Amino acid sequence: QHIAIFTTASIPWLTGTAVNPLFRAAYLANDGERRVTLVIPWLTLKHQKLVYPNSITFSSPSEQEAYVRQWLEERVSFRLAFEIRFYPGKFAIDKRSILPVGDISDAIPDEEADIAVLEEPEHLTWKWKTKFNYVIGIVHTNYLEYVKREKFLKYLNSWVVGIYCHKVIRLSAATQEYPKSIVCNVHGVNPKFLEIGLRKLEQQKLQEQPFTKGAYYIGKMVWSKGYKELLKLLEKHQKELAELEVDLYGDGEDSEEIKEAARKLDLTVNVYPGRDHADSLFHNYKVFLNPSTTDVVCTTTAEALAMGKIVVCANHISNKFFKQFPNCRTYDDGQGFVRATLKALGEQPSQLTEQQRHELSWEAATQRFIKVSDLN
Ligand SMILES: O=c1ccn([C@@H]2O[C@H](COP(=O)(O)OP(=O)(O)O[C@H]3O[C@H](CO)[C@H](O)[C@H](O)[C@H]3O)[C@@H](O)[C@H]2O)c(=O)[nH]1
């Protein structure tokens, strides 16, 4: 059995359709009696500078491949055991997105084709039901919610997917309806986050001081990613949140507008460049504030919980999975946000059961995936 996983982004672009399909591949290919190939976009150097930390650019696919293997080997315990292939892509800046150039199916000879996983089937289907036996799409994005919010897809998405995908996994119910679909959060968290939570637990037990008493958000700096709602909440409740310090981390097109809004508040809210969420600078924040209502599943929330933090997030259907965790505090309104945030700053995060830590893991996500995709 051979699984070909086609996605719309690659490390070092720190975005869900880069990070999650990469872990998926790592943990599928460990499952043992199964060959995994991950198929990722190659950008020319001009486009690479747009999405990579231009610290990081590759003059060939082979370099990018060494870099992606290194990055993932640094993060998982085991030796990787899947293959990596590239298709040519082009970053369309107005789509905020990588568009394929060839038939991407081409990356996989006919002679080895078996099962195809399309991360973001909507774009990747702009060959399929006829070149592979079995095609599974995974919906990572709320396409509708992001184009309907630029300073339609809709019915084409339905049939596009339906024509090409035998099964459709929606990461949550904050998505378009789709044919042959199941809701299932088939993502976990980089095991580094769980390791960081076990280290913060051990510090708590040692009474080191695990935590500083401010908050942070991390995510690409576009208004529609939570920033707009966070800044309005902050601005509405400035007076009650006088003691709150908030650090915001990300890159993107709105970073200068967000900065500008931040310095008009009577709160210390600071804006900084994007950075890997697993970096040591994040390790001691006690509270992660996530007000996105446009994510399908907020991988960053999963990551923050794994690290042992308290997450204050919107009481919205995309956060339904996280509500099983006691350190996840949901709010229906501005008052709820403030009360939840003030209580969290004041208190100790609670500790995660072993059953919780497992539920956030890629080992668990893979089992769910294997199960909802009839791959048994
Ligand atoms: O500055 C950053 C930004 C992101 N990340 C990492 O990137 C991954 C995804 O981050 P986000 O979910 O903030 O990035 P995207 O919004 O760009 O992810 C996309 O897909 C996800 C699911 O795969 C989400 O559900 C969302 O709908 C969609 O835009 C996480 O591992 C997060 O830690 C960083 O390390 N640093």
Residue numbers in the entry: 7 to 132, 138 to 162, 170 to 394
Give the text the authors published on this PDB structure.
The X-ray crystal structure of atDGD2 in complex with its substrate UDP-galactose was solved in space group P41212 to 2.10 Å resolution. The protein crystallizes as a monomer in the asymmetric unit. The atDGD2 monomer has a classic GT-B fold, comprised of two distinct Rossmann-like β/α/β domains connected by a flexible loop region. The nucleotide sugar binds in a deep cleft between the individual N- and C-terminal domains. The atDGD2 structure showed clear electron density for UDP-galactose, which binds the enzyme in the anti glycosidic conformation. The ligand is positioned by residues from both the N- and C-terminal domains of the protein. However, there were four residues (Gly22, His151, Lys243, and Glu321, atDGD2 numbering) which were shown to be entirely conserved between the structures. These residues are important for positioning either the ribose (Glu321), phosphate group (Gly22 and Lys243), or galactose (His151) moieties of atDGD2. In the N-terminal domain there are two areas of missing electron density corresponding to residues 133 to 137 and 163 to 169. B-factor analysis shows that the areas around the missing density in atDGD2 have the highest temperature factors in the structure, which suggests that the absence of electron density is a result of structural flexibility.
